[PDB]
Design a protein around this ligand. Structure first.
Ligand SMILES: CC[C@H]1CN2CCc3cc(OC)c(OC)cc3[C@@H]2C[C@@H]1C[C@H]1NCCc2cc(O)c(OC)cc21
Ligand SMILES: [Mg+2]
Ligand SMILES: [Mg+2]
Ligand SMILES: [Mg+2]
Ligand SMILES: [Mg+2]
Ligand SMILES: [Mg+2]
Ligand SMILES: [Mg+2]
Ligand SMILES: [Mg+2]
Ligand SMILES: [Mg+2]
Ligand SMILES: [Mg+2]
Ligand SMILES: [Mg+2]
Ligand SMILES: [Mg+2]
Ligand SMILES: [Mg+2]
Ligand SMILES: [Mg+2]
Ligand SMILES: [Mg+2]
Ligand SMILES: [Mg+2]
Ligand SMILES: [Mg+2]
Ligand SMILES: [Mg+2]
Ligand SMILES: [Mg+2]
Ligand SMILES: [Mg+2]
Ligand SMILES: [Mg+2]
Ligand SMILES: [Mg+2]
Ligand SMILES: [Mg+2]
Ligand SMILES: [Mg+2]
Ligand SMILES: [Mg+2]
Ligand SMILES: [Mg+2]
Ligand SMILES: [Mg+2]
Ligand SMILES: [Mg+2]
Ligand SMILES: [Mg+2]
Ligand SMILES: [Mg+2]
Ligand SMILES: [Mg+2]
Ligand SMILES: [Mg+2]
Ligand SMILES: [Mg+2]
Ligand SMILES: [Mg+2]
Ligand SMILES: [Mg+2]
Ligand SMILES: [Mg+2]
Ligand SMILES: [Mg+2]
Ligand SMILES: [Mg+2]
Ligand SMILES: [Mg+2]
Ligand SMILES: [Mg+2]
Ligand SMILES: [Mg+2]
Ligand SMILES: [Mg+2]
Ligand SMILES: [Mg+2]
Ligand SMILES: [Mg+2]
Ligand SMILES: [Mg+2]
Ligand SMILES: [Mg+2]
Ligand SMILES: [Mg+2]
Ligand SMILES: [Mg+2]
Ligand SMILES: [Mg+2]
Ligand SMILES: [Mg+2]
Ligand SMILES: [Mg+2]
Lengths: 260, 185, 135
RNA sequence: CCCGUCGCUACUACCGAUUGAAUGGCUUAGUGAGGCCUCCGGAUUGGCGAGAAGCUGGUCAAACUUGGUCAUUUAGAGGAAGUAAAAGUCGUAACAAGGUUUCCGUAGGUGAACCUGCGGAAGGAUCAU
RNA sequence: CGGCACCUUACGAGAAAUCAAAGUCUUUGGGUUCUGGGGGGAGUAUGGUCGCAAGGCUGAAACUUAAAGGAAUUGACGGAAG
RNA sequence: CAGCCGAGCCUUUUUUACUUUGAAAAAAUUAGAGUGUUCAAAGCAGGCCUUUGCUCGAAUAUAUUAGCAUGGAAUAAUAGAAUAGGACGUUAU
RNA sequence: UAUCUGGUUGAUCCUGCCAGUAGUCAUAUGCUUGUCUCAAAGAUUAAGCCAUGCAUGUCUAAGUAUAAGCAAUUUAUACAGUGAAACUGCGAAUGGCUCAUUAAAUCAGUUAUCGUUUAUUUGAUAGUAUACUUGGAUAACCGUGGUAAUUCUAGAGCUAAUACAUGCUUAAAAUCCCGACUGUUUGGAAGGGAUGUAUUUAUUAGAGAUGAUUCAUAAUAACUUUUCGAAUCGCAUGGCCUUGUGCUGGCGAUGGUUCAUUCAAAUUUCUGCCCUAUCAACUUUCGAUGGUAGGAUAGUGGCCUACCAUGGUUUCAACGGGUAACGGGGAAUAAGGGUUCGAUUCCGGAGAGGGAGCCUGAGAAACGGCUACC
RNA sequence: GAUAAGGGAAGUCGGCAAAAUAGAUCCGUAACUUCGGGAUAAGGAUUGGCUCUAAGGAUCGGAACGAUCAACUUAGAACUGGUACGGACAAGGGGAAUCUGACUGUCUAAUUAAAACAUAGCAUUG
């Protein structure tokens, strides 16, 4: 109606932000950016609701206006900047590096990483095509455009971005046996290897994935993210739980043993 | 104003539809350019997204292509001789797309004679180059005959009310024979 | 029946036959075979899936032809059972879908055709015939 | 026990001359603001250009008058009902073979119930000679 | 074999009278058409349609009302029989 | 030892409907796990010997016609070889 | 809690309703009311009418400061701190409210854009065949005012830009066309033009992507009331000597073409809406269904025009009428199946007294914008 | 025999007389009905001139095509003018009701044309 919306009602916010109902009428509307609104995590949510460094939105803005927060090695001062999957957030004042990777419960884990691993990131190739003057380029899942990619790189592949020069270190071809994290649907956050890709021309290709505990699930290729060349060899540190889904009874047993 | 919405029509079953909402700006139309022949007069139109369209209200010349020869030249437009949509556009000389027009033949005759040497003082190398181009210099009879009148048949390919250009290609082959039959009747 | 029956010359756009007739066609994909009447024919149809500029994408439907009285357009009847949960039973219902048929196909009322979705090519036509089974 | 005219009171709805009345939507025709596009125009104002008022023809089209139609309310002399109230007048049609068995369809007649003809039914007063 | 019926019983049904279907229905489902939803107002008013007409078919509402009704029992009564 | 499902071989070995499973399916609301808001309605908190910090969480089901993908072939439809214009010859001429 | 009870009779068993009974995230009202937590609330009738006040403004070191403003003399005689007024930019198209219209419409789930526009964010992307830096306006300001009256403004005099309008600076080749001369068996050539990117055609690759394209991209010939390839702003001030205002250069603001991305938008496939036949035929003059060409649009499309066919929907309920009808998530009650409700905390739609038309802008047919009628 | 400001039947027994309407094309058309009508109901729009366009045929030739010849009808468009145009002529006013005769028809030549006569239909008589 006459133009873009600028507000986000609290109840209409993505559920994986884990916002409380009664704290207010509105929720942080993520800005336009590398990641989609529904699949992002604004820095205000990360710094106040997750890390609890800031006590309120005034404080998260005070933190970010002092140039502390970096996303993918670049300073961001937008409190609603849409950080997303595989993004690296650096707070060198506290000497902390985080990567936004889904945990098996469907949420963005607070996943601390070493400084050496915080120097790169992975990106799922969305499309490969030719730019002006016949220069090929790759579009990753976070909207990055890398020119002159390896001519072997195709869609659904994973590239390793140097994240300081923006170049491609090396890549992983999408194929059977590759380590995968699921980035959408009800299997979001699970980690396994590709068992069989079932093609459907004009429809949605389906990928069969086997967990490390030999559990098999099916998910859309659009929800499939290659993160490693084989089982047990991920190119990034996995969050606690290793993307292994436990039943609610198993979780209850594990909590009973963990707590006594 | 002019609206392109489908709400005002009656359904495929014939039922009249009730009025759903007021006319929206993203479904507007505007008025035809009705391009004539005369000294160039072009008005810009501010379109959706801040883009620009050009209403050619009057044009004299255009870019016309000889497809077989692979050459394009800017030439005057003499008049509209045939229009498959409405004969009143022929009567009033209104330039739209797919209008059959007569264009000045001089730039193409000049290119042809300079390129091949025939009709419709040189060095030895130039004469040899022309001799090499010979054999391919024989064109269709129906096209050759027009050069006597100095005016070639062409069909407008651009949309003058959209781009401000009145461009086209020279009629050839069975398409030319088709419109020749249409003209003579 | 002649190809050049209109006030304008009928031809495929930007397909040039140099005098000093070349036909363009394409396969529509989704495992549908291009009829040889399209590869080898002479009709001109901008709305044909195989020789025209339309593309097949979206839904693939099948139905029974109930009308061929329009030029290059048919109406197919799709029969289905609608479930009424209160009575735990069904009722017969139907919907009429208008589809474009290219001259590469010959259809009569009673045939079963497979139509693929295309861009709106008329007020009521959004489907375009891809396959015909005689009835 | 009980039926119907007739008489009193009250209420509800109906028909009804009045080419009755009022309110709202849609619409033919006529008239038609205004914007937009276009056509000239050329106050004045920079060095051929910019350009206001206005003008031509279109386009979208509010709004008014008449007519038509749809819809919702409402008056009415008089006419003809229904119900409630009390069991007032006249009779006694039904319930017993209710004193002419009753009832149905149909058609005449008549203060009223009703009576009569024709053909049916038993829900008969006969499951039977 | 087909009919028109009848007699007995009640497995069974039914409120009962009664019913070989009015049974095989709370142990509820063989197929299918029509009709009813307390008594009146009322098969009336209105609109439509058929009819020469008489009328047929379709068909309300306001209002009013605590019963109306079915089968059977005992008694009372009968210008019914014994 | 029986029983219950799944298999795999050997025995001459066209269109649906239906049903299974899956993918994708907003939150709030509903059901429901955890959690002494002093109880509760709620909320999504919270807990640790008292912490220049450590640390469980924020589950899970349901949606249901339609569409998509999928396993099954009972039940109910549909088509085929009758003027043969029928089927196979994979390397038949 | 898968429940019933009173009323027809002298008594009986039924049919059957009336009455009783409980709940309501269901309203009103009467009587009554001590505490804690939580909390709806001018929807219904009148999308009826409104006094008054407020509800949308906005400046960083980084667009423009000669305030005849304040403040201090300081690294500063171009300015330098702070800072009204104005110009410029952006926002005002979000939010909030309401439910009048609306019955294949909205909406829900599910699709599509190989059918389009997209400010902004985020990635990429431009050496292209007067320069030590171009002009002339205007506001604020000063002072002359006119009107009873308004967020009215008029003459005259100044003056700025990231406002407005223009304009150069550059690699190395190489390729193509014309071609004086020349070689003279067809080669060499002086001299002229053209190369980036946008626009619009025509003709060629496309035998890297897609299920699929006339896709991406490239090439040839031209075209264009010629798009833009920075005449901008703050802080630091470094390096090389050929010590000349010499040559070079660090972190940033803002901006810019195209592609991608994101926030969106517009159309769009399939199936699904309550009562009514005392609504059975409807649509098609003057678009109804389809074909061809065009116009218009951001783009598809009878969206509109011209010509041509005679089509399209319907007892599987079309069309018409009613709705005390915005749709859905949901709500009440509930053995199961159901019945009833949903103006209303979220999502979609629509409207801003009734209509209609527009300006600006990426975005509005906007109403705390304008124009006209009622 | 014409015309007439403003009003518009107030005139008169009474709209008597006059006026208004009028051709053609297209649109639209109620009650009632003996279903045939009512009906030109009512009520609207257009119409000139000029310049064009389209459609509608015949006979020959072996042909969905050529040759030759030919009549005025209809439809559309542009332009044009003191908005005029069935330009003179020609040419319905209309509607709602009551009484009455069914209708077409007939008579009092020279004061009455009617509701009178006749009529079809119905009935009676010889
Ligand atoms: C010279 C002839 C005219 C003269 N004008 C002068 C103006 C005038 C104006 C009038 O009014 C404006 C008017 O009113 C009537 C009459 C006149 C007379 C009438 C006369 C002819 C006429 N005479 C009497 C009757 C009659 C019969 C006919 O057969 C007939 O045919 C030839 C004609 C006549
Ligand atoms: Mg809003
Ligand atoms: Mg796809
Ligand atoms: Mg059925
Ligand atoms: Mg109505
Ligand atoms: Mg009696
Ligand atoms: Mg009697
Ligand atoms: Mg007697
Ligand atoms: Mg008697
Ligand atoms: Mg008698
Ligand atoms: Mg007698
Ligand atoms: Mg018996
Ligand atoms: Mg019997
Ligand atoms: Mg009843
Ligand atoms: Mg009783
Ligand atoms: Mg209200
Ligand atoms: Mg409210
Ligand atoms: Mg309401
Ligand atoms: Mg109001
Ligand atoms: Mg209301
Ligand atoms: Mg209303
Ligand atoms: Mg913004
Ligand atoms: Mg088109
Ligand atoms: Mg078309
Ligand atoms: Mg309907
Ligand atoms: Mg409403
Ligand atoms: Mg409720
Ligand atoms: Mg609702
Ligand atoms: Mg509702
Ligand atoms: Mg609602
Ligand atoms: Mg609500
Ligand atoms: Mg809302
Ligand atoms: Mg609006
Ligand atoms: Mg308001
Ligand atoms: Mg208004
Ligand atoms: Mg507003
Ligand atoms: Mg408005
Ligand atoms: Mg307001
Ligand atoms: Mg007078
Ligand atoms: Mg007068
Ligand atoms: Mg008058
Ligand atoms: Mg008078
Ligand atoms: Mg008088
Ligand atoms: Mg008098
Ligand atoms: Mg008198
Ligand atoms: Mg007279
Ligand atoms: Mg008339
Ligand atoms: Mg007479
Ligand atoms: Mg006489
Ligand atoms: Mg006499
Ligand atoms: Mg007389």
């Amino acid at each position: 109606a006459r133009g873009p919306k600028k507000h986000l009602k609290r109840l209409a916010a993505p559920s994986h932000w884990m916002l409380d109902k009664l704290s207010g009428t509105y929720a942080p509307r993520p800005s336009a950016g590398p990641h989609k609104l529904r699949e992002s995590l604004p820095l205000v949510v990360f710094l106040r609701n997750r890390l609890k460094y800031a006590l309120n939105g005034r404080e998260v803005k005070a933190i970010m206006m002092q140039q502390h927060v970096q996303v993918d090695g670049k300073v961001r001062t937008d409190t609603t900047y849409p950080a997303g999957f595989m993004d690296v957030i650096t707070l060198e004042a506290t000497n902390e590096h985080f990567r936004l990777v889904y945990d098996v419960k469907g949420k963005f884990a607070v996943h601390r990483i070493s400084a050496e691993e915080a120097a790169y990131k992975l990106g799922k190739v969305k499309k490969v095509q030719l730019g002006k003057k016949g220069v090929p380029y790759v579009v990753t899942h976070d909207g990055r455009t890398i020119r002159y990619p390896d001519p072997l790189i195709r869609a659904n592949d994973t590239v390793k971005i140097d994240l300081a020069t923006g170049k491609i270190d090396d890549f992983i071809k999408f194929d059977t046996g590759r380590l995968v994290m699921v980035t959408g649907g009800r299997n979001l956050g699970r980690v396994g290897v590709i068992v069989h890709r079932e093609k459907h021309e004009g429809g949605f290709d389906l990928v069969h994935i086997k967990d490390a505990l030999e559990n098999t699930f099916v998910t859309r290729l659009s929800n499939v993210f290659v993160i490693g060349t084989e089982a047990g060899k991920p190119w990034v540190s996995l969050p606690k739980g290793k993307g292994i889904k436990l039943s609610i009874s198993e979780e209850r047993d594990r909590r009973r043993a963990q707590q006594g | 104003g002019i609206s392109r919405d489908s709400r005002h029509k009656r359904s495929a079953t014939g039922a009249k539809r009730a009025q759903f909402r007021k006319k929206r700006k993203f479904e507007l139309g505007r008025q035809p350019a009705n391009t004539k022949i005369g000294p160039k007069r072009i008005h810009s139109v501010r379109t959706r997204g801040g883009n620009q369209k050009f209403r050619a209200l009057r044009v004299e010349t255009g870019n016309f292509s000889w497809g077989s020869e692979g050459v394009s030249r800017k030439t005057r437009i003499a008049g509209v001789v045939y229009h498959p949509s409405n004969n009143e556009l022929v009567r009033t000389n209104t330039l739209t797309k797919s209008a059959v027009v007569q264009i000045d033949a001089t730039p193409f005759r000049q290119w042809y004679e300079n390129h091949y040497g025939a009709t419709l003082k040189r060095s030895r190398k130039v004469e040899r180059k022309l001799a090499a181009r010979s054999g391919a210099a024989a064109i269709e009879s129906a096209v050759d005959s027009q050069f006597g009148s100095g005016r070639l048949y062409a069909v407008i390919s651009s949309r003058p009310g959209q781009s401000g250009r009145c461009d086209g290609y020279i009629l050839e082959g069975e398409e030319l024979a088709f419109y020749l039959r249409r003209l003579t009747a | 029946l002649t190809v050049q029956s209109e006030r304008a010359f009928q031809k495929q756009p930007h397909i040039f036959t140099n005098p000093k007739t070349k036909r363009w066609y394409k396969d529509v994909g989704l495992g549908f075979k291009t009829p040889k009447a399209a590869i080898e024919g002479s009709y001109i149809d901008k709305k044909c899936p195989f020789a025209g500029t339309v593309s097949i994408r979206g839904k693939i439907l099948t139905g029974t032809v109930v009308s061929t009285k329009m030029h290059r357009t048919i109406i197919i009847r799709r029969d289905y059972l609608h479930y009424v949960p209160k009575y735990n039973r069904y009722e017969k219902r139907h919907k009429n879908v208008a589809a474009h048929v290219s001259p590469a196909f010959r259809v009569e009322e009673g045939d079963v055709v497979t139509v693929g979705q295309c861009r709106p090519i008329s007020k009521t036509v959004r489907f375009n015939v891809l396959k015909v089974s005689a009835g």
